[PDB]
Design a protein around this ligand. Sequence first.
Ligand SMILES: Cc1ncc(C[n+]2csc(CCOP(=O)(O)OP(=O)(O)O)c2C)c(N)n1
Ligand SMILES: Cc1ncc(C[n+]2csc(CCOP(=O)(O)OP(=O)(O)O)c2C)c(N)n1
Ligand SMILES: O=C(O)C(=O)Cc1ccccc1
Ligand SMILES: O=C(O)C(=O)Cc1ccccc1
Ligand SMILES: [Mg+2]
Ligand SMILES: [Mg+2]
Lengths: 536, 536
Amino acid sequence: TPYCVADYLLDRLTDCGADHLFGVPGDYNLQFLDHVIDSPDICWVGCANELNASYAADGYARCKGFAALLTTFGVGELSAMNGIAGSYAEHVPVLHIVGAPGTASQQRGELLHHTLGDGEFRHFYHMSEPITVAQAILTEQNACYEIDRVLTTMLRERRPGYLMLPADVAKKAATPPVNALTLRHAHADSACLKAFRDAAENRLAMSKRTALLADFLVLRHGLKHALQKWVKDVPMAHATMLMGKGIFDERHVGFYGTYSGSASAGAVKEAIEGADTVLCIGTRFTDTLTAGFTHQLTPSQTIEVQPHASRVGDVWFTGIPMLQAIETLVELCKQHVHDTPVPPDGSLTQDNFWKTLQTFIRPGDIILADQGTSAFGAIDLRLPADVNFIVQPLWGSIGYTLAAAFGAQTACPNRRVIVLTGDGAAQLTIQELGSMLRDKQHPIILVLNNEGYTVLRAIHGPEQRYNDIALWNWTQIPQALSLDPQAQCWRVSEAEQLADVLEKVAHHERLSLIEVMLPKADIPPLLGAITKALEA
Amino acid sequence: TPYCVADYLLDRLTDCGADHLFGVPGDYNLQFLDHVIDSPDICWVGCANELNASYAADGYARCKGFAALLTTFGVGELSAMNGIAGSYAEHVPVLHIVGAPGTASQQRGELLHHTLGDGEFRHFYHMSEPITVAQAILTEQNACYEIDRVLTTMLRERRPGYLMLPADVAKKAATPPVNALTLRHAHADSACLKAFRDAAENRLAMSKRTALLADFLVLRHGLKHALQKWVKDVPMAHATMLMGKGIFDERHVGFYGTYSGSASAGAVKEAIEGADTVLCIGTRFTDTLTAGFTHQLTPSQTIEVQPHASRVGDVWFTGIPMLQAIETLVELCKQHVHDTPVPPDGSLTQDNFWKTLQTFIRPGDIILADQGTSAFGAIDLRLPADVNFIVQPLWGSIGYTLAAAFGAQTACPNRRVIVLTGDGAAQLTIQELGSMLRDKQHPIILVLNNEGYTVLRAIHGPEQRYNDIALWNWTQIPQALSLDPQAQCWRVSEAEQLADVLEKVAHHERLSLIEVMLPKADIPPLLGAITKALEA
Ligand SMILES: Cc1ncc(C[n+]2csc(CCOP(=O)(O)OP(=O)(O)O)c2C)c(N)n1
Ligand SMILES: Cc1ncc(C[n+]2csc(CCOP(=O)(O)OP(=O)(O)O)c2C)c(N)n1
Ligand SMILES: O=C(O)C(=O)Cc1ccccc1
Ligand SMILES: O=C(O)C(=O)Cc1ccccc1
Ligand SMILES: [Mg+2]
Ligand SMILES: [Mg+2]
């Protein structure tokens, strides 16, 4: 077992922050997998299918800052394509490793399984190009520096990378690196940073009341502490949108709720949109996050910070890392901003479900909500400290949440994971519940059983049959997907029942599946406003 | 509800042979779905996820000659990418309809859900290019003739097509066609056909023993009957490979078993490879079908017929329809082939499982086997007449078989569907069993429970844990995926038990799940030949 390219890739994987490898085996990656098994730093996590494996890696990377997925050539990598695209859309650094046929087999154009039968072995590599920031076909002549380049770009951009690893390449000799891969910090040209600073100070110095709006790019680049630190030194009205929920302790002074554009609570609208200067840190104003682009923030009202560029008014200042832009704004805010922010009983409904769940969440929770009433209702939760809130509203792929929960629980085995998934969403990735059971995880899974696609019903054709789903027996699923499930399940239809059951499960001693019976047409407040804005 | 582009697409869809549309709804395709619901000719089939929906359409198209899949922009189409690629690889005409945001939203580059957040709406259209034979972005200015062009190319090439249907384009006015969409058989230039006939006539005239080898491309282009009649009218040693199994009634004289390169029964090798002239009709010599490319067929020994070109010896004759080449060769065989033929108890094992199943299959059966010991064992079955044998050994995506069975059973509600899936494979697409139960289908599902990836174990690392799987309670799955599964399930470990159970479920009055307990290391004969031809 001499040190080879496969070992080099695994060593670089640990350098980037991953302690587990998700995926599904195939004959093209079995020999690479031997090095994963033997590795003392990387844990193989076999998944029920590649799409779930890619979802799990995404959720894993949202907890550890990095993740890796292993698939087999063609059938595996294409199954995971939607997950990688979601990681690209929401800036999640998931490394897609594709085990591939040997280079000699590729060069002869053989009619191998997992190919289109045309002897071409680069179709799927090119198909991955739009959803990755870097990729490489690893050869004997490029492997180690291509691995470093892709991972480095992945770390810089916080977005997926792709490596095609032919089985013969994996075995090629390599030498262990003396230093851990860490390309680290970049600094703006001091004149460029000074110009930004000067422009931001002029704007901030003339601001009567400043507000702060941070979102998911703060999370992805590891600036959550800095933003928390920011609001503590510099009290001001602050909020996130749905994607970046969890950046702030929502019980802190100056926080009035999540910002949603026009769908926002009245206090939130006044706190953020009423400020003459709003600092938008890592924000993307997507249709869902702004309830149909109904946000009212003018360019002259805002200072914007993006990963490599920041904007003051109409002027953009490019080639500035967001970290330096934030440090600049923090210093400036300490000088020029002086605001002192002034502070169950019946049939289950969306309203009393979320109120009941609000009393249940605790610090340290990992909360995942899928698209549908789960995410659009969970936006109203008042998150305590140290909560990792995982939602995917830009990509919006239902089924992500259940499989991502498995990755998150793998990342943080000692943290309580709460899964908020619709009945429709859970059908798409249900087989990863077996992975949770196999690995003895103890998530609290709440299935919002409204018997179909309620969000779709609220958008169009509520009585149409395409909005119906096959009606599953949810409390029986753990017993079918495990020979001895360490789990308990309940079906609740009353608010007192749910609160009583949530009381029972509180310290998550086993996996909990709570089937929540909800009305077919019941809608959380945010989604009602999103539907109200969909008309023309 | 005036007639519009959406109705035109559905009208053309029925013309091509699809009576059902598979997929998953999304807000971008709800209004088109109203036309599917309202249509009296096409039935909406909601699926548990898009990947299973694409698998189901593939199996549906293998029974009706055409199929359609409907997904939503981005999250849906990318989830279905592996299914479409498999349809492209094995020449299955599946139409992928992608409901998309309105053109105005696309033109403004809005930050819409199901996008990468870059305002780009053509990434996923271009990613589908390598795995479709034709595509179009439907506009108000091109919709109807782009629809016709894509379907016509699909009909000609027997391969998937792609249509992006912006929600606004679907509502644009159209006129119902007086002529049903059809693609009239091409005709070879009479000199080119004559040149091939004269070269083939010379080749056959000096051949003492001729054998016939047909495979899946015969099935896709609708030449099954032609090959059947050809061997009836001219008896000769004939065979198929694994992909084209089912072309022949395997009980007629001159059929000795499926051809698998070096892995043949002695009679099959002598029947096919021993012939001085072998007619290869629609054959692709992939690694799995040839047991590692160990087939011995020389160019001078073979006459080969492909969809648009045929070969005699070293000379290719292009621009000849496959039908005309066969017709020509049928004429010639009558002229120059003047010849005729040549001359369960105890613990369940792979050997006695397939022996037991051999006595169970009947005419009219639709048999689907997934990659693994299921497909590699089912190759030894001697099929009776009118059997549709669905295997996917070129693409080889496990999980296809279970979801494809749902599509096939939808296609043929009055035929008995036998599903041969491994435990590993069935985990990937298990949620489509709920679709089977919701639609009151009655397949006989045999899950080969060898507790993990046995074929992978036989290839590499039998004791390695990446070849293990989560151990499910298979007979309990219908009770979890339905509120009233009228299903009958058994766990069998004895052959006498299995035969008794197979007698019980023979007339498929209910869905049957037979969990077949097989040894972890038990191997079908073909896979042993595939393993021995590796790293040699
Ligand atoms: C993979 C995928 N397919 C389709 C969609 C379209 N879509 C968006 S919300 C939704 C319904 C979700 O329903 P459910 O999970 O039951 O949530 P509910 O609103 O009913 O609470 C669908 C199908 C998607 N987002 N992702
Ligand atoms: C979607 C997909 N993922 C991974 C593979 C790689 N692969 C090929 S055969 C196989 C084993 C299949 O196991 P099972 O379905 O239980 O059949 P068995 O060979 O175990 O009888 C695997 C993992 C594949 N072919 N398709
Ligand atoms: O291992 C894989 O990638 C498979 O898909 C299973 C397999 C193994 C050997 C030949 C064909 C398929
Ligand atoms: O319908 C879809 O495509 C969805 O993904 C659900 C949805 C509906 C409205 C806003 C965001 C997501
Ligand atoms: Mg629902
Ligand atoms: Mg198995």
